[PDB]
Design an enzyme around this catalytic site. Structure first.
Site, PDB file in Angstrom:
ATOM      1  CB  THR H   1      -0.853   0.118   1.157  1.00 53.54           C
ATOM      2  OG1 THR H   1      -1.477  -1.009   0.996  1.00 53.54           O
ATOM      3  CG2 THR H   1      -1.651   1.254   1.265  1.00 53.54           C
ATOM      4  CB  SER H   2       1.494   4.105  -2.031  1.00 55.20           C
ATOM      5  OG  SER H   2       2.156   3.372  -2.567  1.00 55.20           O
ATOM      6  N   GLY H 128       1.967   3.374   4.476  1.00 53.40           N
ATOM      7  CA  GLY H 128       1.997   2.227   3.566  1.00 53.40           C
ATOM      8  C   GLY H 128       3.460   2.025   3.135  1.00 53.40           C
ATOM      9  CB  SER H 129       5.116  -0.748   1.270  1.00 46.74           C
ATOM     10  OG  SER H 129       4.053  -1.038   0.401  1.00 46.74           O
TER      11      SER H 129
END
Ligand SMILES: [Mg+2]
Ligand SMILES: [Mg+2]
Ligand SMILES: [Mg+2]
Ligand SMILES: [Mg+2]
Lengths: 222, 125, 233, 204, 222, 195, 212, 196, 195, 196
Positions: H1-2, H128-129
């Site tokens: 997720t971003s 998020g990642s």
């Protein structure tokens, strides 16, 4: 397992293969992975076999009671909510991976549930070990505004991809069509593309072949 | 490593280094073996140009290889120690693996094999 | 004993009536970081072979150098280096297969899955797979990584057995390959949109296509999807 | 220390023409040591037969449990339980111990007394029903039994022929398994007669 | 940590007649739940009327076959083109296998041919070179399914003469090549039904004094 | 603990149980009686985890004695064995299971028959002509397979038992300090003092 | 496995089963667990099938080389020690062997040596080796006398393997008998347990635990 | 997720990619990570799909019951309910949530709640990642009191870069605009954002 | 292996060594001689890892016999013990160390004195009036601390040794099948046949 | 570490922070991570200080011996020597090196060599723990054929952000300019770059 769900014009269709495995061994060559939650809400289930059946029966039971309590036809989102909260509670230990679909007063619906309690929405979905073979077909041939007969074709083609290419999947294709305004039609063994060929030989033994030590009549009466 | 082939054939088919080694034996003090009906006796000459010798400690001419086999020799004294040592080691090795002391034929065959090896190995006489 | 660092994902391929097609995207992944975008993972050997490589990129670059050296070494004292004694796809494969199995046997593998696609001197199609374990196999369609799970099922619908190969044209084959590449971009989290594709035909020879893009994608239906269940807005 | 293979044993069931057969070996061991050659793994509650492989203490416990439950069923229902209903009871009972299961491989066999239809079913240790037209297998030689049944079996066998087929399926499967054998029992079941036969087999 | 072994599935089967021997094997090659190839042969003619299969980890299997084939070549070079008898091949293969005792070839090896009296011969090896001549042997993933069937139908185990009170055994007799191929085909179709790693195709190599013949049959592809 | 044997003959059940109690590198006792009388015609021998063994034995003994007083009646050996099995079958899924293996030798007075039951800590019950727990079985079963006959006398059973003890004293690694032998028949339970 | 060999008045009896196992899978029922090294020497196999087979046939080659070099048949002591010294070199590497080297020579008489893969070498009159050894001991010890006849000794060896074949899950198949005299070894047949058990049960009256 | 949420002049906008993942397989390429817990209080979800859904469902229930008794809850209140769940169940949760809402008194507000269950009120938040790759870009480009069109472009360009580098991120860029005017849903497809 | 004891008295060294060879749950032999004669007046007993024990013992035996033949002379017990210690001290840092514990009983003919050396697998050497390896010491040392006198006869030493074996046979867990006793004195090495 | 090298019109510039770390303790706050392996071939070092120093020393030795025999080595050649060491000793190394040099034929060139020992020729390269935070920024801001002043600003702004977010990075920003004109060393202190 390979399982799929596909939405169309006036409803939704789900399909599944019929193989059951224990390690590399085929335990059941014609098992039913399509589950009835309510008359017009059906579930396709991959994962731990007893879990998918038990969680489908429990929520199906509670959905029936709810329907009777509310004097209303059950909604897919209710089955979705009840399944996800039950599965979440068990932190993935109940290994049920489900595609939930059906029609209700609100319309036609297609969802999937993961064992840990996540849900998603889509027009086309696939789960199980053969989901990548199925999804490849779905991503290749799916389009907006499918007809009933087009969606059945797409769904069963996606299951076939799993049957032929995934060792976890095999045997037959089961289908269930849920159309708005009509009765859901469960199509058990819709396709049977894996019929065993005639054996080369009959292995019927001459009577008396087996050595016997004792005989006795068993009493089954009272 | 020193590799030179010291023992080689001559035109007439002789290996001179082996034959010259025999001359060293011919120079050595006389040794004699006689076997009876129930014994073997080994006799050895000791030259008497050496007075003031200490016979307690001077290497004896007949050596025990094991408690049942003996070895005497003629020729270079220093050379014989190497053969005797190897023979004594093989004697103990044979007892260890076969669980039986060497036969006199076997012990002899080993000693002779060592001697032969020094006639077609590089860098040795 | 290793662990792969910079990696390349799927390599996909199939046989058609006159030759073979092979494709692989131009990405060099660093774990979840999509680090390098100009990475060519298809390497031609002569005018009759293309070697497609997935897995560790440092090891891929080593294999490049080995193949490059093999061409040089074959040319030595060889007046027929560009004729009867040119490198065949089968020679190139067996060499790599030997190396791969030797390295696994020394417990220091080249962390790769490799597909050698080409056409032999007699016109026969060559397509064979080898990986870090030294495992080799051949099939009308071959794919590595996610390609094995998603491309193969699609490519097998076109060529399902040997007898389907004469019935498959280069147009139909390339179409299936290009479609499979799109599907991989939808579904593989370490794929890129940009890829290379190579055709080795027994008549037209080696055609190497660079800087291809996945296109004709379906995303419009995303606007209709809201929530994950009960949410309406 | 794998609970399902400490004691050893096998069970197999087959359908024929208006009949069913269920068979089991007699061995009970403790790993390598054979202890008993009289340990039967098939039980019955009225006309419904249940075979159970796996951990022998659970085999005994479950028999006692299903005798308990079918006795109360009969008292309240005023009729004998049918194979289809009993199959459901077995499934419910096993799944009740989902996260602390009985280490067993049960097999239901019998003829529905109302419809006359032959019925067989199998379960995993946690309750998943495996229904079959032809045969169900269970135990430490299940692979062997699968191979024997899949080749030897043909549909609509007569009771006397079905006996030969199921016996040869069990015997030859048991002889390729160290933990199975030491005797065998076969039940031939018709609509209103049941014959029980002990088989002569190698005792190693 | 790097694992130097893998499992490529499949299964093989060898039967010996009076003046012939067959060595059969399915053509499916797998890793995990994927099919690598539907037709990848693993039964090979090694020369001198010896057929060989090394089933399990294909990389080791191919390496062994490659080394034995090479061993046959050098046996001719070193011993004036003398024919390598099946018993001598067996002993040679033991040394090939045991030479890697502490880093084994992960394979079940079977060879078939004719002995020096012209009679059919089958030899089977464990992964480290223990070997034994038999009338009958199945190897690989579905060996446990097929072997008991072979005991029953080739060696007539547990079969007694009808009416003799289980006192007189069914007498041993050689099977015709027609009878043997029937058993092979039934063995593999049965295995295909219940083992996920077995299917696609069946290739049988038959060995008589006239040479090595091949027969191919389709198997279920699911 | 360690060695417990049982032989059922024509008219009696004979139980032999080792006398040693060893902890570490010390034999703490050489006259230990690894048995409890559950009822006048029922005897139970036991082996297993230290503490667990006697605690379980005496717990069972108390329950059977309680039953006897309540009903003024002696439970059959079969009934007692089934009770004991169920207690162990409960135990195996407890927080801390009883690690105790038992043999139950009884004379059913209603049937006029000796009965021997072998039950392990899992609750695995079998009726047997002869039984053993632990490593003992690995020597005695094959021996008894050869020499045992179903119609033997108590004296023949004792000689058959001497043959087992002799074999164990020859081939077993540990010194188990002989056995205490007890006979269960129509007249109840008695101990052989000179074995 | 179950294997045994015992010394008595009339020489040496050697008896073995014929089963091979891979876990609970019965791999073979017809394995040859006695290797005939020469007309006067026998070797028994227990543990790893390949280990035993490979190294005991290798041992045979070493024994042949001894009699070529020494013009005399190798002693049972020296033959056993070749094997024990070999496996001691591999100690820790994971070889799995329980073997017995049985034979007659003039200087030794009838002799049996136990040799295993951790390097143990023992001279003795009676040994049983394998997963069924204890079952064989039970019967063999309780019927053994030095003064057994050749006929009785053969039966006892056969009966002891049968005892183990029956009780030990990993033993079975058939019994292979051998008798070693001053004149060499004599094979006394392959005896399938399938028939032998019922024949012994009926004639002897034993095995009453089994449903007749 | 971003994921990200950004306050601006007229309120606040939430943004997210549409990729759900299991290892390197994309289980869902059209996921909706922007979730309604109230009419004008929404959240961006990152971490475990199951955990964040279960939390969001409970929060939505709490705020519905809050509204029934006390009227519209503040964005701060919504964040506190999220915190309470995330903090007290920190051992059993993998959830990184950004809460964003529009009051008329307080205008746009953003609260970020990382793994531990701490609360942080910020002008804008990324999580998020894929967020790791745009810390530099976002810090350099964010301004307070941006217009709607500027804020849309800021989120579009930011998530475009996050998607470009993070394998776990991708698909479409969804956005939700929270103002006095109402609630607007925006979607942006690869063909637009990839070539930015 | 397991039990090896040694007692040095006025004029002799007495070694007692258990006769059992146990592997798993089987006593494979009950007449094993766990000793080697290194020279006419030097005896070594040994216990430890299977294979290692005899291999080491015979290797030492070969070396001392080799020395004897080379020099036509018998090494002193002290010299032999030091050689053995060094071999074990080398071994302990090898790729695979000898796991063997030894006692060396010798009669020094130059000194006219008995000598007993205890050496463990690490190469830890001590001269002692009485010695033991393994668990044996835990019973015998205290016993000998009480009953041993430095001026005892060979007969008194044997009675003192009987007392040790009796204690071990009473309190040790395992059946070690008695001991073989050997005496080392001015006249060499001899075995007591009736113990 | 945050390190980078960027090609431009007149050649190439290398950049680095000055923080050497042992856990959260800063062992050296004035480290020089820009290292000469030849007159106009330099490298940026990231990963293990010991490994990267030992490698750089060996490379400098190799190129000195190369120069003695064959004259000035190409930047590609220098990168190949780095690769050879990093690839063949991958099991025993933790080194992420960026190689940058100036030819007159080839102008500015940048090669990055990650953990595995692969080689990648790029217009510009970023590496080290702090690089993660500036992938977005650098991709958005890099242009080919920038001027010296533009490239200095690009590196200064980029490393400023990398330093701001990465705890492992900090201290001064060192830079080395490689052109036909020669070799220039630049240094930039916190008080300048922090408030960018
Ligand atoms: Mg057995
Ligand atoms: Mg399939
Ligand atoms: Mg280092
Ligand atoms: Mg900093």
């Amino acid at each position: 397992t390979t399982i799929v769900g596909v939405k169309f014009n006036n409803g939704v269709v789900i399909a599944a293969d019929t193989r059951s495995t224990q390690g590399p061994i085929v335990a059941d060559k014609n098992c039913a992975k399509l589950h009835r939650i309510s008359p017009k809400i059906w579930c396709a289930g991959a994962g731990t076999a007893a879990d998918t059946e038990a969680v489908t029966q429990l929520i199906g039971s509670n959905i029936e009671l709810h329907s009777l309590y509310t004097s209303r036809e059950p909604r897919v989102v209710s089955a979705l909510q009840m399944l996800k909260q039950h599965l979440f509670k068990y932190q993935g230990h109940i290994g049920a991976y489900l595609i939930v679909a059906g029609v209700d007063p609100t319309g036609s619906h297609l969802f999937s549930i993961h064992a840990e309690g996540s849900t998603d929405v889509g027009y086309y979905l696939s789960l199980g070990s053969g989901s990548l073979a199925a999804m490849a077909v779905l991503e290749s041939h799916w389009k907006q505004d499918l007809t009933k007969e087009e969606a059945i074709k797409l769904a069963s083609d996606a299951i076939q991809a799993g049957i032929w290419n995934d060792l976890g999947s095999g045997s037959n294709v089961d289908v269930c069509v849920m159309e708005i305004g009509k009765d859901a039609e469960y199509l058990r063994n819709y396709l049977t593309p894996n019929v065993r060929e005639e054996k080369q030989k009959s292995y019927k033994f001459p009577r008396g072949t087996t050595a016997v030590l004792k005989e006795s009549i068993v009493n089954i009466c009272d | 490593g020193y590799d030179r082939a010291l023992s080689i054939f001559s035109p007439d088919g002789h290996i001179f280094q082996v034959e010259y080694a025999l001359e060293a034996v011919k120079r050595g003090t006389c040794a004699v073996g006689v076997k009876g009906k129930n014994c073997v006796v080994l006799g050895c000459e000791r030259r008497s140009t050496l007075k003031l010798q200490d016979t307690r400690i001077t290497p004896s001419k007949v050596s025990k290889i094991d408690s049942h086999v003996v070895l005497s020799f003629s020729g270079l004294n220093a050379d014989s120690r190497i053969l005797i040592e190897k023979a004594r080691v093989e004697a103990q090795s044979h007892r260890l693996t076969l669980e039986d002391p060497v036969t006199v034929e076997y012990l002899t065959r080993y000693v002779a094999g060592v001697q032969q090896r020094y006639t077609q190995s590089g860098g040795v006489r | 004993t290793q662990q792969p660092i910079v990696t390349g994902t799927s390599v996909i391929s199939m046989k058609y009536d006159n030759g073979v097609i092979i494709a692989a995207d131009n990405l060099g992944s660093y774990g979840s970081l999509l680090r390098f975008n100009g990475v060519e993972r298809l390497i031609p050997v002569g005018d009759n072979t293309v070697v497609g490589i997935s897995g560790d990129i440092s090891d891929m670059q080593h294999i490049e150098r080995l193949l490059k050296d093999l061409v040089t070494e074959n040319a030595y004292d060889n007046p027929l280096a560009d004729a009867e004694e040119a490198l065949e796809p089968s020679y190139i494969f067996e060499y790599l297969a030997t190396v791969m199995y030797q390295r696994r046997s020394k417990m220091n593998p080249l962390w790769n899955a490799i597909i050698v696609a080409g056409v032999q001197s007699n016109g026969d199609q060559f397509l064979r797979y080898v990986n870090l374990l030294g495992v080799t196999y051949s099939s009308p369609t071959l794919a590595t990584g996610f390609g094995a799970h998603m491309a193969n099922p699609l490519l097998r619908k076109v060529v399902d057995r040997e007898s389907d190969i004469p019935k498959t044209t280069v147009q139909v084959a390339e179409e299936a390959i290009v479609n499979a590449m799109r599907v991989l971009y939808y579904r593989d989290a370490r794929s890129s949109r940009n890829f290379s594709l190579a055709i080795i035909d027994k008549n037209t020879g080696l055609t190497f296509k660079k800087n291809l893009q996945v296109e004709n994608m379906k995303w419009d239906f995303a606007k209709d999807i809201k929530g994950y269940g009960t949410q309406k807005i | 220390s794998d609970p399902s293979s400490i004691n050893g044993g096998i069970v197999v069931a087959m359908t024929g023409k208006d009949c069913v057969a269920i068979a089991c070996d007699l061995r009970l061991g403790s790993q390598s040591l054979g202890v008993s050659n009289k340990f039967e793994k098939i039980f019955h509650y009225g006309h419904v037969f249940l075979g159970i492989t796996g951990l022998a203490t659970d085999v005994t416990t479950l028999n006692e449990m299903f005798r308990y439950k079918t006795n109360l069923y009969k008292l309240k229902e005023e009729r004998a339980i049918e194979p289809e209903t009993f199959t459901q009871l077995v499934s419910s009972s096993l799944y009740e111990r989902r996260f602390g299961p009985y280490f067993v491989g049960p097999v239901v066999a019998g003829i529905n007394s109302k419809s006359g239809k032959p019925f067989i079913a199998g379960f995993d240790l946690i309750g998943c029903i495996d229904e079959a037209k032809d045969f169900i297998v269970s135990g430490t030689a299940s692979d062997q039994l699968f191979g024997m049944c899949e080749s030897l079996y043909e549909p609509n066998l007569e009771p006397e022929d079905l006996f030969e087929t199921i016996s040869q399926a069990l015997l030859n499967a048991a002889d390729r398994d160290a933990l199975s054998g030491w005797g065998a029992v076969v039940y031939i079941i018709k609509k209103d007669e049941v014959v029980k036969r002990y088989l002569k087999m190698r005792q190693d | 940590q790097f694992n130097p072994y893998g499992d490529n599935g499949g299964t093989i089967l060898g039967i010996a007649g009076e003046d012939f021997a067959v060595l059969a094997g399915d053509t499916r090659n797998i890793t995990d739940y994927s099919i690598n190839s539907r037709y990848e042969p693993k039964v090979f003619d090694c020369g001198d009327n010896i057929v060989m299969s090394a089933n399990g980890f294909a990389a080791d299997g191919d390496a062994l076959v490659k080394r034995f084939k090479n061993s046959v070549k050098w046996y001719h070079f070193d011993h004036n083109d003398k024919k390598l008898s099946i018993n001598s091949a067996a002993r040679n293969i033991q040394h090939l296998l045991y030479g890697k005792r502490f880093f084994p070839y992960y394979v079940h090896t079977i060879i078939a041919g004719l002995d020096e009296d012209g009679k059919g011969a089958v030899y089977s090896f464990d992964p480290v070179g223990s070997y034994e001549r038999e009338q009958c042997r199945a190897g690989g993933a579905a060996a446990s399914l097929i072997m008991p069937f072979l005991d029953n139908q080739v060696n007539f185990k547990n079969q007694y003469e009808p009416g003799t009170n289980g006192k007189v055994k069914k007498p041993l007799k050689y099977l015709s090549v027609e009878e043997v191929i029937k058993l092979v085909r039934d063995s593999f179709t049965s295995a295909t039904e219940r083992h996920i790693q077995v299917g696609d195709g069946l290739e049988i190599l038959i060995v008589t004094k006239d040479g090595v013949r091949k027969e191919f049959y389709e198997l279920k592809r699911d | 603990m360690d060695i417990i044997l049982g032989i059922r003959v024509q008219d009696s059940v004979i139980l032999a149980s080792s006398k040693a109690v060893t902890r570490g590198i010390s034999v703490l006792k050489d006259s230990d009686d690894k048995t409890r009388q559950l009822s006048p015609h029922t005897l139970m021998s036991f082996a297993g985890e230290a503490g667990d063994t006697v605690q379980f034995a005496e717990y069972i003994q108390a329950n059977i004695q309680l039953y006897s007083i309540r009903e003024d009646y002696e439970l059959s050996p079969q009934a007692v064995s089934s009770f004991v099995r169920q207690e162990l079958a409960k135990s195996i899924r407890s927080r801390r299971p009883y690690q105790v293996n038992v043999l139950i030798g009884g004379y059913d007075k209603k049937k006029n028959k000796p009965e021997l039951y072998q039950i392990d800590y899992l609750g695995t019950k079998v009726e047997l002509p002869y039984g053993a727990h632990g490593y003992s079985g690995f020597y005695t079963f094959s021996l008894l397979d050869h020499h045992y006959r179903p119609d033997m006398t108590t004296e023949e059973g004792l000689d058959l038992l001497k043959l087992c003890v002799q074999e164990l004293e020859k081939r077993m690694p540990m010194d188990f300090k002989g056995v205490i032998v007890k006979i269960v028949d129509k007249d109840g339970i008695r101990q052989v003092d000179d074995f | 496995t179950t294997t045994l060999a015992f010394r008595f008045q009339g020489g040496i009896i050697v008896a073995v089963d014929s089963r091979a196992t891979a876990g609970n899978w019965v791999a073979s029922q017809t394995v040859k667990k006695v290797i005939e090294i020469n007309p006067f020497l026998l070797g028994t196999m227990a543990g790893g099938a390949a280990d035993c087979q490979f190294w005991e046939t290798w041992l045979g080659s070493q024994c042949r080389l001894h009699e070529l070099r020494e013009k005399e048949r190798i002693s049972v002591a020296a033959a056993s020690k070749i094997l024990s010294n070999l496996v001691y070199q591999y100690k820790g590497a994971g070889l799995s062997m329980g073997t017995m080297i049985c034979g007659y020579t003039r200087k030794e008489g009838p002799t049996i040596y136990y040799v295993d893969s951790d390097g143990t070498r023992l001279k003795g009159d009676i040994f049983c080796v394998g997963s069924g050894q204890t079952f064989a001991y039970g019967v063999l010890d309780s019927n053994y006398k030095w003064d057994l006849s050749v006929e009785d000794a053969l039966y006892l060896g056969k009966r002891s393997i049968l005892a183990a074949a029956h009780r030990d899950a990993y033993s079975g198949g058939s019994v292979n008998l051998y008798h070693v005299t001053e004149d060499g070894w004599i094979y006394h047949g392959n005896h399938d347990v399938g028939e032998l058990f019922w024949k012994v049960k009926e004639e002897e009256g034993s095995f009453n635990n089994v449903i007749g | 997720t971003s994921i990200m949420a950004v306050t601006f002049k007229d309120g606040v906008i939430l943004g997210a990619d549409s990729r759900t993942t299991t290892g390197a397989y994309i289980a869902n390429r059209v996921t909706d990570k922007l979730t309604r817990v109230h009419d004008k209080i929404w959240c961006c979800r990152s971490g475990s799909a199951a955990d964040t859904q279960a939390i969001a469902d409970i929060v939505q229930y709490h705020l519905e019951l809050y509204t029934s008794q006390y009227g519209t809850p503040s964005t701060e209140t919504a964040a506190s309910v999220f915190k309470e769940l995330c903090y007290e169940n920190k051992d059993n949760l993998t959830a990184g949530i950004i809460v964003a809402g529009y009051d008329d008194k307080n205008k746009g507000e953003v609260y970020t709640i990382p793994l531990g269950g701490s609360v942080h009120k910020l002008p804008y938040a990324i999580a998020g990642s894929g967020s790791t790759f745009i810390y530099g870009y976002c810090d350099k480009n964010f301004r307070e009191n941006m217009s709607k069109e500027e804020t849309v472009d800021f989120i579009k360009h930011s998530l475009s870069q996050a998607i470009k580098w993070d394998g776990s991120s991708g698909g479409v860029i969804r956005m939700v605009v929270l103002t006095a005017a109402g609630v607007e849903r925006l979607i942006f497809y690869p063909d637009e954002y990839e070539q930015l």
